[PDB]
Ligand binder design. Structure first.
Ligand SMILES: OC[C@H]1O[C@H](O[C@H]2[C@H](O)[C@@H](O)[C@@H](O[C@H]3[C@H](O)[C@@H](O)[C@@H](O[C@H]4[C@H](O)[C@@H](O)[C@@H](O[C@H]5[C@H](O)[C@@H](O)[C@@H](O[C@H]6[C@H](O)[C@@H](O)[C@@H](O[C@H]7[C@H](O)[C@@H](O)[C@@H](O)O[C@@H]7CO)O[C@@H]6CO)O[C@@H]5CO)O[C@@H]4CO)O[C@@H]3CO)O[C@@H]2CO)[C@H](O)[C@@H](O)[C@@H]1O
Length: 106
């Protein structure tokens, strides 16, 4: 029911199974073609040069607003933390939980 005040992209929710990492993200609908991904760090907290990636996809719009929902679920066996990246209209935005990124306590 609650949504982002101003961010172009912001984390709705996330979860880890031990097996599987999933979640939802708030995306500001600024242009039609989008690219929203989650980039996480090693079970050893290694970023692999931003290479541990997980593509999210459009799930549904949020009525009464200029924001929408994207979802991500994938199989991951080792993960310490992550951040969210968003590209549209040649611009990039990020959700890095105010530079600390999101820790996954597994
Ligand atoms: O794998 C299949 C498919 O993958 C890609 O498509 C992705 C998008 O990349 C991704 O962003 C997401 O789209 C969501 C979006 O996030 C939501 O906001 C919503 O979209 C709204 C949108 O916000 C509205 O503004 C409105 O869109 C207008 C648009 O503003 C206007 O420009 C025009 O769109 C044309 C566009 O400019 C052209 O580039 C072109 O694009 C074509 C591709 O060329 C063609 O190959 C094929 O993919 O279809 C594309 C779109 O048809 O033509 C566009 C029109 O034909 O008009 C639109 C309205 O038609 O409305 C939409 C809501 O309808 O929802 C979308 C998803 O529903 O998810 C999609 C789907 O996976 C990749 O871009 C695409 O090429 C691949 O086929």
């Amino acid at each position: 029911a609650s949504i982002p005040s101003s961010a172009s992209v912001q984390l709705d929710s996330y979860n880890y199974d031990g097996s599987t990492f999933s979640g939802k993200i708030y995306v500001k609908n600024i242009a039609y073609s989008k690219k929203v991904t989650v980039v996480y760090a090693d079970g050893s907290d290694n970023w692999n040069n931003n290479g541990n990636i997980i593509a999210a996809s459009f799930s549904g719009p949020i009525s009464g607003s200029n924001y929408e929902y994207w979802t991500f679920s994938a199989s991951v066996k080792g993960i310490k933390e992550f951040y969210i990246k968003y590209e549209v209209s040649g611009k990039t935005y990020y959700d890095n939980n105010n530079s600390a990124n999101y820790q996954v306590s597994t």
